[model samples]
Target: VPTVVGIPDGTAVVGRSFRVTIPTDLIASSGDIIKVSAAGKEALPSWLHWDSQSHTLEGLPLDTDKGVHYISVSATRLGANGSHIPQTSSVFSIEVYPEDHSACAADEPVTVLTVILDADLTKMTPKQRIDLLHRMRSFSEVELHNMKLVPVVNNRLFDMSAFMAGPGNAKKVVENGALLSWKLGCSLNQNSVPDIHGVEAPAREGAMSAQLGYPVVGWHIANKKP
Candidate 1:
């Protein structure tokens, strides 16, 4: 049986239109059939309907429906012969609070990004780059090789904009690489931090990973202690 993942419990308010969407990622395959039903001996109340096409259960709940409703979502995988395989299911509760209740919103779905390697795209020699790729590919194999790589310091060494790229997206990539390197017990080289915060401190991903989480990756410019 194929397993479903990432389903979460949620809350809804009485008198409000309620929607609990089964995430598309949980669909085992395009051919699998999805079934939703009230758990135990109970039938789904008149307020709610599950639509396979939309993959959501929507309802108009009332005060009478107040309290927790347990539901089971199952996916039935179809075999090559078009026969139904035994299904796998996940159970999660959806609580319907009274209209004036202070219940928080339902949990949102999340996906973690794959790994990222911080490297100076321009500085590495061709052999070093090729060997790096070979090592990662050999270990991760083919299917698990998910990574985003970028330079911690751009090659246009004198360009102010190149060194101080926007930190939001940049920080995330380097942070992942830095964490991996530190956990692997390798020296974490640095590219000065591109900080707009105070004094221009460089090397957040390196510092962050050393503290938060390497490999002896070389740095284009060694970060100085501010």
Candidate 2:
């Protein structure tokens, strides 16, 4: 398959020697060719040039080029039978900004750290999570920049256990009063960070009780420091 990886974060500050390369192979152990162009039916911005030799879309973005620029790449692979494979392409944007001493120059592509919070994680393994991330990357509405799932050896979290053990005032009530079970309510977004990041139930009633039943053990998988 022709995989376009390392899509540039695409924000260039004015007057910077801006050079971003899409450093990925067009084919895996096969003969392939690549074509680069501005994404729309348009010419590349006057300030930029696509270097075919190194797969780089670069140039100093002048003050005039301070706008959003989008680019696309085409990968065509040739088969052993002297036939051609269908072309695969990916597109991304390069938003140029006039420098104001903040933010645009401090740019890096967003790297979302993903984790699972299912009630049962018995069969989930590093290989499975990595494979799932790869498959998930393929189904993006727009092409995802090169996605690498780092299965860093260390520790992970217990989603339900932590929610069962979260610290807060009971005068406000420990959990949701609306729910009959009165389970402590955690914002789905808030559930993954500091709440789940801890290593233990820490002698707390809820965390201990939930784990005594579910046995959400092996927090060492995420705690690498020992």
Candidate 3:
């Protein structure tokens, strides 16, 4: 699925590049052609410019004064009298706050480390798998302490525990919201970054990996029609 678009923050300075993600469907159908305008009370400014490839709307003249600026994006589609799809998100606004100097280039900002425990379902011995699962929880604590992440481990091994502990134990975990990232490829858009809840929730509903036609777990096993 495509990501939602529209500026989430405001008050940017000149010589800075801000990032915004528009719905992928829109980008796929209508190529990226954006226009950015920032102006004062008397008529909008005529010196604004936009870059489609970079998805950046930059103000010209690095030494310009700062203030609130109105902004919008559009893609050229169809023919003359064509229109750009406006972001369905909130109305656009950028309150440009001046700074003593420029912000770190969007590419060079200090990087924060995140230790993601992507469950590797690659073939391994049962003992190796169980050991790996236990280690994931401890790794999460370290990652959280590093301030890189809060530790949302996708515990694939939890399903094996359920098999040993019985269905009641597995059901308990689901009620508490630990999602199952089945080796069976499925992708779902989850802003919360779900953990292994049970035996069947796919990592994502339609992961590119699944698109490659790997044999997914639940597809043949669960919810079949006669």
Can you give the TM-score per candidate against the true fold?
0.39, 0.37, 0.28
Once fitted onto the true fold, the runs of candidate 2 whose alpha carbons sit more than 4 angstroms away are 1-8, 26-29, 77-86, 102-226
lDDT of 3 by residue, 46-162 (tens): 323344455544332122435656654433344455655443322367654443333223443222112222223232222332333333333232321112111123443232212
Candidate 3 lDDT score at position 213:
24
lDDT of each: 0.44, 0.41, 0.31
Full ranking by lDDT: 1, 2, 3
Task: Compute the lDDT for candidate 3.
Answer: 0.31
Which run of 10 residues does model 3 get worst, by summed lDDT?
Answer: 217-226
Reference-based lDDT, residue 149, model 1: 27
For 1-226, candidate 2 gives per-residue lDDT tens digits of: 3344546457875534356777546322345576666876546666566666776666544455678887776667777897767567677788877744211122432212222222221233322322333333322212222222222222333223322233311212222111001111123223343433332332122342232222222221121110
Badly placed stretches (over 4 Å) of model 3 are 1-5, 14-28, 31-34, 38-48, 60-64, 80-91, 101-226
Estimate, for each residue in 1-226, the C-alpha lDDT of model 1 and write its tens digit. Answer: 6455757898876534456678755655666677777875345655566766777776645456778888877677878998878567777888888754521124421111112344443444323433343444332233211322223333221222122221211332332231111011112232322323321122233432232122322222122111
> After TM-score superposition, what is the CA distance of residue 180 in candidate 1 from its true location, in Å?
55
Cα RMSD, each candidate: 18.2, 17.7, 20.0
The best-first sequence of candidates by TM-score reads: 1, 2, 3
